[PDB]
């Protein structure tokens, strides 16, 4: 046998337990002010219908540090982010980074000259200190508002941000300059919807945008909002409606047994 | 022309009655008819074909008679009669096949084929068994300047022409008021749509009308007027009239108010029906004029009130629809039907041997163009070819 | 002009001219030259009924309502005139028909004789126009007296039909009534 | 036999085919070239979708002639057969499917079943000429 | 005259300008003057002829609201969220988002009233402050006296652009410092579909209708997020395809003006 | 419904109160030497058949100041200009600016390089201080009687004029240099005849030309002349023949209810 | 029937068509390439105009043969019908338009009206053979 060669399917119209991780900010831990709370929540999940010891818990120091290459190792993930009235773009970037499959190819800054092909193409830069400076070019590689040999006339697009998403106009090459010793830029192309995760916001005012497209503001059903003053109420609320949360989501399509040459990461 | 029908009917009756063992005293009439036919037929040759790929064939006639000596038919007499009968059947089939393809612009009611033209001579006029069949009887009655008729089931008379006419139109199609109709087969479905939902309409009532002509006068039409049309009740995206842009259609079906159905003839009112649904009867009509009114709901409910914002921003247009079906009708001229394969026979015979398109029938016998511009000469030629087709279909099942 | 000679009433082209003639003839209802009931009677009756039923009208408001109602009510008026067993009828909206009183056979329209006769002759409001009359003569077995009075719009036979609750007369009356609005 | 006989392009309405045993339908869904606000937004080039696009054809045959016995909804033969069969609760025969479920009979259309159907329908037609 | 607008029609079944309004804050932050050439050449690479893209500057949202002057056929305008300026933001967006027909008012002498839901009072100027008092059939002020002006009721004070409504159907006597503002009676006809508004930060504050119970979000009122204005410029330029597919072009103004004058 | 798609019309051959503004120069006001003259003229217009209070009156300080973006807000307009033996071109420009519909697109002076397409294309510059200097270019953007970097060799076409109309030969680009702080130049294309206005001249000798076309000197019926020594006689004359003036003109075709996507301003 | 039978290009004078029921005329007005002072000025490319341009065709049929009864100006039939009708001031019949207004009769040409016209004209032709 062999997978990947999608043979057309034909059905009919005459018919009638896994891992679950959960993240939280340090402020939640301080407000909880307890030691055995993990056992309590695990037993509550046991009551709701999950095996004990199958609900892990992790933690992130800050929204900034959580942005440094956010990994996920769960079959069902819900991420809790604390809204802040000044890091709106950071929250939008975090949602757009952990909400869709990203297929990346490494990119240099010294030898080659990179560009973009289609609207489904983006640039993602992650690192401790990310300073991105860009400069468009013409066909004859001359100067357009910036000289290639010079480096002090390049236009900033994002400075010192722990996460940086950027996009340039298709059809033109651009040269880069960024500290490789502190930041990494990767050429990535957006595949599609990654359903393995959901985002729950505390407070906020519907700020997140999951794409750079202006004319569309898709409010996904996976993006959900609540209100809070004591973290325990939010924890109880999110635990209570586990059935709705899991019903909204689905299995990570890229993690099923159909992986073979399906352009898995 | 009647000679051919007489021959076909006599052959079929002989094939029906001449079976082994039957008493001769029950086929005396047919025996006399067959002997007379053999006496008159012999000695005259025939020629058929010569156009397209149709096989040219020559014909001879030298046969005995059927004497009266037995009291009950035996196998051998039946076999001899059957052997003659099959040959005559092949003769009739080939003559019909020759006749069906050809046509003429002038004298399009007279015979054209050489064999048929020779058959029309007087010395063959002694064979006419009956004229009981519908098409041959209609032809015979039409021969002597009399009113005719045809019992038709689902008599497709409406040409296929999908079209719409706007009444109020924004340049970018955000405030539309107009009508959509589709006349397929013998089925008419007319829908009247509004974007304003009668919020800015005069007297809060929008007027709709639609007139559809008919090239041929019918009679005794049982009309099933069913509201809540289905052709336009689902989302659509279509190109505009100029073919340079498109538009959207988000429909909601309301209750059609004060449905008025009118049937006219010669420019006068014949039969009218107000606010009646179901089955109605019309006796004589030539033009159909459907008009009604779309009424804004006098009072609403939260969902309904939101669904029809008074201001310009619109996301749900309203529409009413009616369906017009002719489940039975009688016409005065030959037309396509569904109770036989007459038009099917014409099309098949035309396409099988690839006769080049003549000066009357549009290419491929596409019914839409044939019924589009109806002219009396075309009607006469179609009548003759359909009579010959019905003759063919009464021999080969 | 459109009549036989010059007169103060003869001053789709046929449709437009007939519509103008009907619009001018609407003023005949103030000339006391009518027979039987007329449109303005129905307008006054409905105005009285809705005045009595309504309660949200101040005494300062009555003149405006009366002025607007006396004009805007019933824009779709029809008139018919009779000449030697023949009847010609014209509508404001652009309808025009002609028929005989014996068997209601369709008659070709002649504008000249219509204009010749409507100048000085009895005029009757066409509450029962040709559509309702023909539908009634077809679907219901009426006698000659009923039809002749209907062409004259006799109140007694019309009210008898109302009593019988014939759907066609109910439809005609309800269509007429629904149009009564500002 | 896989060979093209009757072909029609953009002929909506009534068309006729002379002799066929296989029907092949092909249509193409084309994105409109120029748009207007409504359609220009309702078809996004990004991932999330609110409305899918679809085209469809309705093909109905109104009359036909076959060289073998076939049932129809315009006569009273199959009804006669099933009524006579269920009249006396006969055990299911070794040929016909149970209860004359027409779909089951037409599924594995066998020549033997065709001959049996021909005989049964002929006998039913003989019977229908009398009981009026 | 009528090629088919509102009259029967039968169907079947490059050199265009593009302006761009940017606040002074972006230019001050990026601190360059050659960026115009860069954007023009990027547009050329995208497929638009050079010199066909204008650029205009406004000092402040308040200043830009002073008699707006459209300068193209297609238009995209940028605005930045403010803590306590949502009224002006939404009112300006609504004004430059719909067509208007205004009859000049001699507010000093006569009285006025509207006629329907589709009527509004529009006032613009350097410093506007309106005060109104409703009337009755006895020509005496309700909660006010017709002679004195201080005892009136405030509707707007020291505001650059005021869009207001009253109880439509009863006359009212208004008062304002006419020598520093202007009041015009206007009626909202329909949607001006050749202008879009892009929000830079915020939470979808704009409402384009005085109706409280209806507040839609059309295809020309979107939002993005920003940390450096070059990102916003690049994103706007790259996705010009969507923006040009959204709006139409047959809504060209017969003359260079925001709202028509007595037509 | 929708307008703009002009469906062909078909008629037959068998058939038989608004606003009125008026302008005048200050010299007329001084010569009148009266206060209640407005009421007198309004009552005269009432006698002739117009409603009272429907005939406004405005004023312009000078022909120069009247030239600064001449607006019109009337359904019927007649403009009175006092002839002067030295501002002939100014009067011609004023007539050609307020007599025809003008469709304009904004034009820069710094980034782009503008040109002209057809004879129906013109350049209009209005401002307090308009100094226009031009320079033609070749294909290779070299110098032709002027250098792009230089700015002191550009040929003047109009200096300090309150109104400036200019036209250059089609098929070549031209660079501009003008004080944006005092003058505005707008690229405009002439649509056609604007019938909403008429021009009445006092004195004069048939000077106005309504186009740059040499071979044509179209004396429109809307251009009319009189003679005067006391302004009251001219006012009485223009009031008396109101019927002829209104019969000459017609409704502003671009202001009717056919505006929808008819390229209205 | 929308099909081209007789076509002629730049054939001014006398042409013949064999069998037709619909007439389609197309001509093109072309601006002359080279001019002379008079025409070079009288057609300005600017807005104001003193003379408009127009082209025109005159098509006259002189003889024809029809399969149905039609009136003509070369015989004395319609005059006979109208004279006999107005001779006694007959009320207008339920078929023919008033006073035999030929335009009104030919407008809504109905088969019944065609048959009535045929009978009336035949009777008139019978009458015209005697009263000389």
Residue numbers in the entry:
A (entry chain O), F (entry chain O): 51 to 66, 78 to 326
B (entry chain n): 1 to 397
C (entry chain C): 583 to 593, 606 to 776
D (entry chain o), G (entry chain o): 266 to 397
E (entry chain N): 51 to 63, 77 to 326
Question: What did the original publication write about this model?
Answer:
The ER was extensively reorganized, characterized by gross dilation of the lumen, which contained clusters of TLPs. From the three-dimensional tomograms (STAR Methods) particles were extracted for the completed TLP (n = 279), eDLP (n = 138), DLP (n = 42), and the SLP (n = 28). Each particle type was subjected to subtomogram refinement and averaging within the Warp-Relion-M framework while imposing icosahedral symmetry, resulting in reconstructions at estimated resolutions of 6.9 Å (TLP), 7.7 Å (eDLP), 12.0 Å (DLP), and 26.9 Å (SLP). To improve the resolution, deviations from the icosahedral geometry were permitted by enforcing only 5-fold symmetry, at the icosahedral 5-fold axes, applied to the appropriate asymmetric portion of the capsid. This produced global resolutions of 4.2 Å (TLP), 7.2 Å (eDLP), and 10.2 Å (DLP). Lastly, we find that the structure of the non-infectious intracellular rotavirus TLP differs from the fully infectious mature virion.
Rotavirus, a non-turreted member of the Reoviridae, has a triple-layered capsid that is assembled stepwise in two separate compartments in the infected cell: the virus-induced viroplasm and the endoplasmic reticulum (ER). The icosahedral inner layer of the virus, composed of 120 copies of VP2, is in direct contact with the dsRNA genome and encloses 11 copies of the viral polymerase VP1 and a similar but undetermined number of copies of the capping enzyme VP3.2 The intermediate layer consists of 260 homotrimers of VP6 arranged in a T = 13 lattice on the surface of the inner layer. The outermost protein layer consists of 260 trimers of the glycosylated protein VP7, with the inter-subunit interfaces stabilized by Ca2+ ions 2,3 and 60 trimers of VP4 forming spikes which mediate virus attachment and entry. VP4 is a homotrimer of three chains (A–C) associated in an unusual asymmetric arrangement in the infection competent TLP form.
